[PDB]
């Protein structure tokens, strides 16, 4: 009975880890969108036909 009652803490730590990974995935969604925008920015800046103000 004590071994069965002790499992609630195991379930609590498991859900806490799930929520931590969820917050990390939201931040990763933001970081990937920002990295993609940085990609087209660098891809446009690579062109030599731009004037100085655009670069």
């Amino acid at each position: 009975s004590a071994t069965a009652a002790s499992m609630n803490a195991v379930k609590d730590s498991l859900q806490r880890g799930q929520s931590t990974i969820d917050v990390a995935l939201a931040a990763g969604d933001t970081i990937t969108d920002l990295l993609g925008k940085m990609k087209e920015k660098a891809l446009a800046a690579s062109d030599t036909s731009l004037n100085t103000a655009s670069f």
Partner: protein
């Protein structure tokens, strides 16, 4: 989990609906203005080059 307080699935569905509404209003503004870059928020660098041009 059969909670009568928290309802995580409704929060997730609300997040997806909010994202869909954002894409829809973006399409509405792009349709009515006729431009994919109507303002500095859409793309500040391309907006600047287009304004100077």
């Amino acid at each position: 989990l059969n909670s009568i307080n928290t309802n995580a699935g409704a929060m997730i569905a609300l997040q997806n609906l909010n994202g869909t509404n954002s894409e829809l209003t973006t399409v509405q503004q792009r349709i009515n203005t006729g431009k994919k870059i109507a303002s500095a928020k859409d793309n500040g660098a391309i907006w600047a080059t287009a304004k100077n041009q």
